RNA sequence: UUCAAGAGGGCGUGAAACCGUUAAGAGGUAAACGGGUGGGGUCCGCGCAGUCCGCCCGGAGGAUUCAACCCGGCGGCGCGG
RNA sequence: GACCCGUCUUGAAACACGGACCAAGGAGUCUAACACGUGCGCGAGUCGGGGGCUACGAAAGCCGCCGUGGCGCAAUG
RNA sequence: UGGAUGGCGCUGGAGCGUCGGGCCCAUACCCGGCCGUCGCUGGCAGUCGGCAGAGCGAGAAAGAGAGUGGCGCGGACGCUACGCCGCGACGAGUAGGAGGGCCGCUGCGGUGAGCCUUGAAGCCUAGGGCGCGGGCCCGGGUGGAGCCGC
């Protein structure tokens, strides 16, 4: 009822939330982006108990299930029709994601061509 | 405040040098001026020797 | 008076010219540069002297 | 918890060259091959010497090759220098040779071909002799630069011959106090 | 918190972690070394069984500065063929009765990785005489290998 | 030569593409389309290319000879196959096998053309 | 190459690579070479011995042309005259000798350093040295002066 | 009136702090956060009878239909000892 | 489970100081010299930087009886 | 100031002294999975195919050694060598040092037969997702003329 991936492995991840900057909610001029705090009084860098955790490398993911969509496909970014001849050999692993600025008179001829080659397109009903 | 081992040296910049700085951006537009005032000199005296 | 200009040696300027003439003869380093050379019959293309006329 | 000091776990030797040319990396691709596959250590020495810098593969002059080839026993024997070969003019009698170097200067190349010699490259050393037999290996003077006359024990310090850094040597640049015996001291 | 003269010894018997065990042959020149670290060790004299249940279970080799286990005789017979030691039961006759070639089968054995003792030690610091765990205990060490091994 | 211009082309060509931690290539006679030494088609003396027919049906096969290498006009040769499914794959297994012509590119030059025959079917 | 420096990798660190206890102030130890004799004494007594004092005689209107005298060795004395003259000179049985001019080639004085191959020469120069004269008298050939 | 007042005489775009009103969910240890679940909402599944591709046997259908020879054209290796 | 962040400090939650709130702007740069590592060319020699000759181009290319000159090849009193 | 075996409270103890058995838990020790660095200067140019025949991991320095009278038209993946694959031990960290950044901004030579009034930048978002992270990408709204990747 879809285009099946080749093999469907069980995706496990080691952390599902984000990281937020320390003292981000008390202010507004503090964004929710990560900046390694460099004080000397501090509690986060010295890893007290019950505080905000930090981004070490141990949260890295397995090289077999990295960058994998939940459907089991990798992504690839496409502007025109000419770059879908790339994927007629690498087919069952990677998927195409049509860019934003492409207007709605061309996506009618890209998605049809990407239905003969049996290539999955992530956003096939974008504009209409 | 010299460190371990470097040569001693005395720079001559204790004066105000930024006021008197002679740039040379003229140079490829003065070799053309001298080339014109030498060829129009070489055509004023038509059969004479050009080099003095 | 920031140091705008640079100078390079002579015998490196001439080695770059010999190393840029030696790769305008292969039909792969020209196609991969981007030109459209699918049909030209000979890559060191030498034409008669009546083009200056 | 284990009280190993992690101070010198990483070796600081060099693996691969910093050079971006491709006529060196096409020969490294052939002796990376011939260093893990064959048994003999001539390849494992020349590989190590194709990584080092310019100031650690110094130029071998030709009269240290006539000297280091006139030694009895080494007849009909090719040389291998990973460095370069420059010409000399203070030699009037050159014998025939068989040299395998990188760069041969255009006065000495023509000095040897007139004397009936022969210059190979490091691909025809591979066709001629892979496992390293019947090659005399050389190198140039390592500690020959002028820098190595500044180093060592600091001057003004007894029993120490060492050139200091002077902007110009003369009759009043560093001659006076620590050197004479009447102006203070000597060392 | 370790004394510097001690830590050299515990790195001359190759005892780097906590809960590491080795086999040491005895003489006058190694009793006085094992006397200076009486507060940190608990040594004994093992039975025949607790050499089997340390070689067969927690016994790993040392092949080229690595740690490769023992699943065949040919892993021994590479590095000990020059001593007529071609299996495991010759290495055990050597350790139990200490043969001439004890050094070349004790530098080869990687230090053992024991677990935490079940049940619980009495008190770590003091001597085994006054109700501790350190010091000599000549044949109670098989009541600490059947517990930890 | 070959290893000279792989050491040149491997990173600064224009048929090359880099995005999403990936790498592809748009050479005119490539298959699997990815930048490697064996699947480039501008360097070697012998190259295999498989293209769709210029018309709606069929599969063309672009070879390359050895005589006129520097003459890009008559260096290649195009043939056209418009047949059923078995004998086309057999006449490509034969073109690449029984001439000993670059035998490394056989299975991928059958897979890509069995995907052109899958492609040019009337869709339901 | 602003992008290869160090300060572009230090945006985020507070002190910018110069400490926090004793900060990077302007001039701690005087400006330039201050304290040759007071408190930078050890650097000059250990790395520039004899920085301090006077020695010798003064000489006021000193030119660098009255004492112009470039040198040469006997090693490369044959490099001035081209190769085919040393050949014809070693080839002829008569007993002639090729004349070597140094002043023409930009040298005045003839010193003597190395071995010299055995064939007769005649040297026109302005000075000599005693070893470099007894090597040519020992091979055979002369030493001719010129003003 | 204009394509447009969602461009109205300091009139392109119209950001946050901030305030007004609407809808929801709460409220005795100042509020806020971290780790962990649970409930309630908004939404997507363009989910709501769930794989496909090879190969053989069987069942029924139909073509412009195979192997082989014959001419014509191209291409490849040639150690022709 | 959990005291508010920056900062000097042996020692910050501190009865130590600056800080009501949001947007934009904001702090190791530029020459000369020297020292050492490193990449490139030529090699006992090397370098044309000043001078000449023939839209982009105020660029590029040449000159050796224009190599004078600089550093180097020989130190010491 | 109204207050401290930590609190409530505790006398066949929940008090003091000597000792038994059994049980609780930390990021410590063992075993297992995953990331990353270091390390063996570890392993692959032998995809050698009807001219072929499928090789060296075996306890014992050295050639499945060469010369010698003694029917069918068939065989996965790979290797951007700055790559890919395998085995071991290790990982705390201020001032400070170094390396990698397919993180990012504004601009120039090159190049994408790039995209764009069938709607670009920029904003907004209880919309869908990836990355250790810096950050980016997509859908849905406003907006009206120039923009991005290598
Ligand atoms: Mg502190
Ligand atoms: Mg200082
Ligand atoms: Mg550990
Ligand atoms: Mg450390
Ligand atoms: Mg238990
Ligand atoms: Mg820091
Ligand atoms: Mg610093
Ligand atoms: Mg400061
Ligand atoms: Mg101080
Ligand atoms: Mg400073
Ligand atoms: Mg509008
Ligand atoms: Mg407005
Ligand atoms: Mg409101
Ligand atoms: Mg409510
Ligand atoms: Mg609590
Ligand atoms: Mg302060
Ligand atoms: Mg102070
Ligand atoms: Mg104080
Ligand atoms: Mg301090
Ligand atoms: Mg503080
Ligand atoms: Mg103050
Ligand atoms: Mg205040
Ligand atoms: Mg700003
Ligand atoms: Mg240098
Ligand atoms: Mg636990
Ligand atoms: Mg483990
Ligand atoms: Mg660490
Ligand atoms: Mg919001
Ligand atoms: Mg407008």
Swiss-Prot record, chain A:
Q: Which residues carry this modification: N6-succinyllysine?
A: 49
Please explain the role this protein plays, according to its UniProt record: Component of the large ribosomal subunit. The ribosome is a large ribonucleoprotein complex responsible for the synthesis of proteins in the cell.
Q: Which family does it belong to?
A: Belongs to the eukaryotic ribosomal protein eL32 family.
What's the protein called, per UniProt?
Large ribosomal subunit protein eL32
PROSITE patterns, per the entry: RIBOSOMAL_L32E
Where would I find the Glycyl lysine isopeptide (Lys-Gly) (interchain with G-Cter in SUMO2) crosslink on this chain?
8
Gene Ontology terms, MF aspect: structural constituent of ribosome
On assembly, the entry states: Component of the large ribosomal subunit.
- UniProt key word Ribonucleoprotein: yes
Coiled-coil ranges (or none): none
The record's subcellular location field reads:
Cytoplasm
From Swiss-Prot, chain C:
Q: Where in the cell is it found?
A: Cytoplasm
PTM section of the record: Citrullinated by PADI4.
Family to which this protein belongs? Belongs to the universal ribosomal protein uL4 family.
- Provide the function of this protein: Component of the large ribosomal subunit. The ribosome is a large ribonucleoprotein complex responsible for the synthesis of proteins in the cell.
Assembly and partners? Component of the large ribosomal subunit. May bind IPO9 with low affinity. Interacts with RBM3.
This protein's name = Large ribosomal subunit protein uL4
Q: What is the lineage of its organism?
A: Eukaryota, Metazoa, Chordata, Craniata, Vertebrata
Q: Which gene encodes it?
A: RPL4
Q: Which residues of the full protein are shown?
A: 108 to 160 of 413
UniProtKB/Swiss-Prot annotation, chain E:
> Which keywords has UniProt assigned to this entry?
Acetylation, Cytoplasm, Phosphoprotein, Repeat, Ribonucleoprotein, Ribosomal protein, RNA-binding
Residues recorded as bearing N6-acetyllysine in the entry: 25
| Cleaved signal peptide residues | none
**Any single GO BP term:** maturation of LSU-rRNA from tricistronic rRNA transcript (SSU-rRNA, 5.8S rRNA, LSU-rRNA)
* Predominant subcellular localization, coarse grouping: cytoplasm
Any one GO cellular component localisation term in the record: cytosolic large ribosomal subunit
The chain residues annotated with the modification N6-succinyllysine are 28
Described function? Component of the large ribosomal subunit. The ribosome is a large ribonucleoprotein complex responsible for the synthesis of proteins in the cell. Binds to G-rich structures in 28S rRNA and in mRNAs. Plays a regulatory role in the translation apparatus; inhibits cell-free translation of mRNAs.
On subunit structure and binding partners, the annotation says: Component of the large ribosomal subunit. Homodimer. Interacts with DHX33.
The family annotation for this protein states: Belongs to the universal ribosomal protein uL30 family.
What name does this protein carry?
Large ribosomal subunit protein uL30
| Covered range of the whole protein | 60 to 208 of 208
Swiss-Prot record, chain F:
InterPro entries, per database record: Ribosomal_eL28, Ribosomal_eL28/Mak16
- Where is the protein localized? Cytoplasm
Database matches in Gene3D superfamilies: 3.30.390.110
Keywords attached to this entry:
Acetylation, Cytoplasm, Isopeptide bond, Phosphoprotein, Ribonucleoprotein, Ribosomal protein, Ubl conjugation
Residues annotated as carrying N-acetylserine in the record are: 1
Instruction: Give the primary localization class.
Output: cytoplasm
**One MF term in GO for this entry?**
structural constituent of ribosome
Entry's Gene Ontology BP terms: translation
**Endpoints of the signal sequence:** none
In the record, the note on similarity to other proteins reads: Belongs to the eukaryotic ribosomal protein eL28 family.
State what this protein does: Component of the large ribosomal subunit. The ribosome is a large ribonucleoprotein complex responsible for the synthesis of proteins in the cell.
Under the subunit heading, UniProt states: Component of the large ribosomal subunit.
Protein name per Swiss-Prot or TrEMBL? Large ribosomal subunit protein eL28
Organism this protein belongs to: Oryctolagus cuniculus (Rabbit)
